Design a protein around this ligand. Sequence first.
Ligand SMILES: *CCC(=O)N1CCN(CCc2cnn(-c3nccc4c(=O)[nH]cnc34)c2)CC1
Ligand SMILES: [Mn+2]
Ligand SMILES: [Mn+2]
Ligand SMILES: [Zn+2]
Length: 439
Amino acid sequence: MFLPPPECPVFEPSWEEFADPFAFIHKIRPIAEQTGICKVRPPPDWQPPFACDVDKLHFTPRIQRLNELEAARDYTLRTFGEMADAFKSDYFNMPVHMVPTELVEKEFWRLVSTIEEDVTVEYGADIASKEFGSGFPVRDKLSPEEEEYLDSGWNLNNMPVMEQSVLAHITADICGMKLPWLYVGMCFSSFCWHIEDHWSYSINYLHWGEPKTWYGVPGYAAEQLENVMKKLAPELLVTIMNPNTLMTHEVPVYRTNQCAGEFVITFPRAYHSGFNQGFNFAEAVNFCTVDWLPLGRQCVEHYRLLHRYCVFSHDEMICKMASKADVLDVVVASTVQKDMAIMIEDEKALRETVRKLGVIDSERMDFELLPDDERQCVKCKTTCFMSAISCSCKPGLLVCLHHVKELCSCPPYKYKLRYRYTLDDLYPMMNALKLRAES
Ligand SMILES: *CCC(=O)N1CCN(CCc2cnn(-c3nccc4c(=O)[nH]cnc34)c2)CC1
Ligand SMILES: [Mn+2]
Ligand SMILES: [Mn+2]
Ligand SMILES: [Zn+2]
């Protein structure tokens, strides 16, 4: 038996509300952050055209064996869809459009929990927009109808580069966290419980096909969910776990059926999972708002405790924006300035601590020029930028300032503090942000 979780919130914005996606996301945040995910239906006439040749775009999908708590060939879009439809109609012995969504959901959770069944499916997942092309129109002759949607904020190609996005002036290739990803689904293909890199937002648009079923958990319950999954499946790596099991342990869970033409938004640190009802085509991108900035700093601290790799350096992003203060949105400048003040005070305290450990020598270093795998802390794997410690006895190795004692057997007077900026360089950068924000 499966008891469906309660429905997440659904918004139907007016044209005035819809005109600015970041203003609308900030508007709904008080409600939606209490449920982790939400759904947005655009105005009825917002109808971006989709054009793909089903025969000229190829992919190799991942094979999925349906098993709860458990951690190939080439298709065209046409041949995948023929495989997908025949699978679903043979599975239920019905036409695909007659299979109720409540029954597919019930059957999915039965399937993953029975070991007597060996059902396997395929999922065209994490296809890069760069090779395959986007489902939204982009500049590359386009029709006037496609030109109408080129500059829409809800065209997911635009959202990362708008002024309210805090990566808009970041030119580093912060790994496809600025380019959309595509997902070609079939019946029962799924995504496991997870949160986004650096606790970012995500936004997902279903271009066409049968619905995508979601489950979501609010950001405030993240550690509660993690404690529950540690007790029940310590081997974890992500997995499928029945939402009724989380609910039994007092974790709040919400559901929705996302249909063609609808958006789903996930909020910072919000766990989510789901599965596809049938053949469909989705597109998604990550993004970061000013709301997110202090959570982004908390996230990198949490990664350090766990010894987890970073996708980018948060401090490097902050300093890059400071160096472009004159072209930032004024509310962006204000919020970056507050995060930078915390950064500088934490950095000041860390440098005093390592000096009292006996590190005396020092030298400026342009960390941003090193490949990422050449500037990770030996102990905690954090990506260094503000500063690190090196030792002549172990060339090329770095520790962050929390892990001075983990580098060398040599005494600390043989160490060197490598630093990007003096404290005296940092305070004028923060003042430029203040001037920008106060005007
Ligand atoms: C830069 C590193 C890289 O290349 N990666 C590959 C893509 N990875 C994204 C994984 C991810 C995150 N969230 N989902 C997900 N969320 C919601 C809905 C989804 C769906 O419908 N189907 C699949 N995945 C979904 C996937 C980042 C790392
Ligand atoms: Mn996700
Ligand atoms: Mn440690
Ligand atoms: Zn470290």
